Design an enzyme around this catalytic site. Structure first.
Site, mmCIF file in Angstrom:
data_model
loop_
_atom_site.group_PDB
_atom_site.id
_atom_site.type_symbol
_atom_site.label_atom_id
_atom_site.label_comp_id
_atom_site.label_asym_id
_atom_site.label_seq_id
_atom_site.Cartn_x
_atom_site.Cartn_y
_atom_site.Cartn_z
ATOM 1 C CG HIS A 44 -0.655 0.494 2.416
ATOM 2 N ND1 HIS A 44 -0.404 -0.347 3.490
ATOM 3 C CD2 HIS A 44 -0.456 1.756 2.861
ATOM 4 C CE1 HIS A 44 -0.108 0.386 4.546
ATOM 5 N NE2 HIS A 44 -0.135 1.658 4.194
ATOM 6 C CG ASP A 93 -0.250 -3.748 2.875
ATOM 7 O OD1 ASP A 93 0.297 -3.428 1.810
ATOM 8 O OD2 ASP A 93 -0.471 -2.968 3.823
ATOM 9 N N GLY A 179 2.633 6.117 8.748
ATOM 10 C CA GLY A 179 4.059 6.398 8.471
ATOM 11 C C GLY A 179 4.947 5.247 8.947
ATOM 12 C CB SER A 181 2.466 1.756 6.421
ATOM 13 O OG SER A 181 1.219 1.904 7.086
ATOM 14 N N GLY A 182 4.838 -0.599 6.402
ATOM 15 C CA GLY A 182 5.927 -1.229 5.639
ATOM 16 C C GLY A 182 7.133 -1.594 6.486
HETATM 17 N N1 LIG Z 1 -8.438 -6.487 5.496
HETATM 18 C C1 LIG Z 1 -8.572 -5.319 5.247
HETATM 19 C C2 LIG Z 1 -8.738 -3.938 4.940
HETATM 20 C C3 LIG Z 1 -9.795 -3.530 4.114
HETATM 21 C C4 LIG Z 1 -9.982 -2.180 3.812
HETATM 22 C C5 LIG Z 1 -9.118 -1.222 4.334
HETATM 23 C C6 LIG Z 1 -8.056 -1.587 5.176
HETATM 24 C C7 LIG Z 1 -7.141 -0.602 5.709
HETATM 25 N N2 LIG Z 1 -6.435 0.181 4.641
HETATM 26 C C8 LIG Z 1 -5.833 -0.589 3.524
HETATM 27 C C9 LIG Z 1 -4.829 -1.658 4.014
HETATM 28 C C10 LIG Z 1 -3.344 -1.427 4.288
HETATM 29 C C11 LIG Z 1 -3.807 -1.865 2.941
HETATM 30 C C12 LIG Z 1 -7.657 0.230 6.806
HETATM 31 C C13 LIG Z 1 -8.924 -0.019 7.380
HETATM 32 C C14 LIG Z 1 -9.396 0.760 8.411
HETATM 33 C C15 LIG Z 1 -8.613 1.768 8.942
HETATM 34 F F1 LIG Z 1 -9.133 2.450 9.942
HETATM 35 C C16 LIG Z 1 -7.353 2.045 8.409
HETATM 36 N N3 LIG Z 1 -6.673 3.094 8.983
HETATM 37 C C17 LIG Z 1 -5.316 3.023 9.290
HETATM 38 O O1 LIG Z 1 -4.678 1.985 9.069
HETATM 39 C C18 LIG Z 1 -4.696 4.088 9.918
HETATM 40 C C19 LIG Z 1 -5.202 5.315 10.141
HETATM 41 C C20 LIG Z 1 -4.269 6.032 10.780
HETATM 42 C C21 LIG Z 1 -4.316 7.487 11.250
HETATM 43 F F2 LIG Z 1 -5.082 7.502 12.265
HETATM 44 F F3 LIG Z 1 -3.069 7.885 11.603
HETATM 45 F F4 LIG Z 1 -4.706 8.261 10.386
HETATM 46 N N4 LIG Z 1 -3.182 5.323 10.995
HETATM 47 N N5 LIG Z 1 -3.419 4.097 10.456
HETATM 48 C C22 LIG Z 1 -2.503 3.119 10.617
HETATM 49 C C23 LIG Z 1 -1.408 2.893 9.758
HETATM 50 C C24 LIG Z 1 -0.538 1.870 10.056
HETATM 51 C C25 LIG Z 1 -0.765 1.034 11.154
HETATM 52 C C26 LIG Z 1 -1.842 1.234 12.003
HETATM 53 C C27 LIG Z 1 -1.997 0.334 13.131
HETATM 54 N N6 LIG Z 1 -2.467 1.048 14.359
HETATM 55 C C28 LIG Z 1 -2.711 2.302 11.740
HETATM 56 C C29 LIG Z 1 -6.896 1.279 7.346
HETATM 57 C C30 LIG Z 1 -7.885 -2.966 5.463
#
Ligand SMILES: N#Cc1cccc([C@@H](NCC2CC2)c2ccc(F)c(NC(=O)c3cc(C(F)(F)F)nn3-c3cccc(CN)c3)c2)c1
Length: 229
Positions: A44, A93, A179, A181-182
């Site tokens: 991602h 991912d 940030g 991530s990865g």
């Molecule tokens: N199965 C499934 C799936 C389906 C749809 C969407 C997602 C997912 N995004 C795509 C994935 C990575 C390829 C997803 C779902 C729901 C969520 F709430 C998020 N949000 C975040 O992650 C996220 C948001 C934030 C911040 F608050 F900073 F903006 N940080 N972060 C984040 C960033 C890194 C780590 C973590 C682990 N606390 C969190 C992300 C997953």
């Protein structure tokens, strides 16, 4: 990283910063050095991709503020996004980066070994709170794994697959965040660090009963070996 502390020089020598240089240069994601010419990261992290050149990969660094023109960096020769990665889903991912030139191993710059655990650490320069900013000094936090069953219980709106591992505390307060991530989730096996996870996603950061979700590296070892040789 939420709830973590400053890392020390040479402590996480496999941690890299994936940065983009446009007008300004910025850190987008972590990764893990797994060989002289190979970085493992989250697919991602390339969701903006098609922008030609403009990737710089920094290894053997602790402080993003001490990056200048003088700071050596790697360049991308090739990106291999897993065939089953879909931007719309959050599955599979994982991506490999072939660097244009091999990096030497030193006490500051060397690979994490690849191949259930409490002694686990997540590292990176991501947000230290949800409405946060990229951190200067590489953060570290100790977080236990939870079972997939427990993780799935917490995430009824998503499918937690056998190819995911989750890490967090019932009452939150320690987590990866945007940030990070990865970057690595490493756990201690028999006096040695192993790469167990790649930071993928969660419902926000450090919320109670909303653990971090990681790509489970052990479940991609056939794909990692095939693509790297
Ligand atoms: N199965 C499934 C799936 C389906 C749809 C969407 C997602 C997912 N995004 C795509 C994935 C990575 C390829 C997803 C779902 C729901 C969520 F709430 C998020 N949000 C975040 O992650 C996220 C948001 C934030 C911040 F608050 F900073 F903006 N940080 N972060 C984040 C960033 C890194 C780590 C973590 C682990 N606390 C969190 C992300 C997953």
């Amino acid at each position: 990283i939420v709830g973590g502390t400053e890392s020390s020089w040479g402590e996480w020598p496999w941690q890299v910063s994936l940065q983009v240089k446009l007008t300004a240069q910025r850190h987008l994601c972590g990764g893990s050095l797994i060989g002289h010419q190979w970085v493992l990261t989250a697919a991602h992290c390339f969701d903006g991709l098609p922008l030609q050149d403009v990737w710089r990969i920094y290894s053997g660094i602790l402080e993003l503020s001490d990056i200048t023109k003088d700071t050596p960096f790697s360049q991308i020769k090739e990106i291999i996004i897993h065939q089953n990665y879909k931007v719309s889903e959050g599955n599979h991912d994982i991506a490999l980066i072939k660097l244009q030139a091999p990096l030497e191993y030193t006490e500051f710059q060397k690979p994490i070994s690849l191949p259930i655990y409490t002694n686990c650490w997540v590292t990176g320069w991501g947000f230290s709170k949800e409405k946060g900013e990229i951190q200067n000094i590489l953060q570290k936090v100790n977080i236990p794994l939870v079972t997939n069953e427990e993780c799935q219980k917490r995430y009824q709106d998503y499918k937690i697959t056998q190819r995911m591992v989750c890490a967090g505390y019932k009452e939150g307060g320690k987590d990866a965040c945007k940030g990070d991530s990865g970057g690595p989730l490493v756990c201690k096996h028999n006096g040695m660090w192993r790469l167990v996870g790649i930071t993928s996603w969660g419902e926000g950061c450090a919320r109670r009963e909303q653990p971090g979700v990681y790509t489970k590296v052990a479940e991609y070892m056939d794909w990692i070996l095939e693509k790297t040789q």
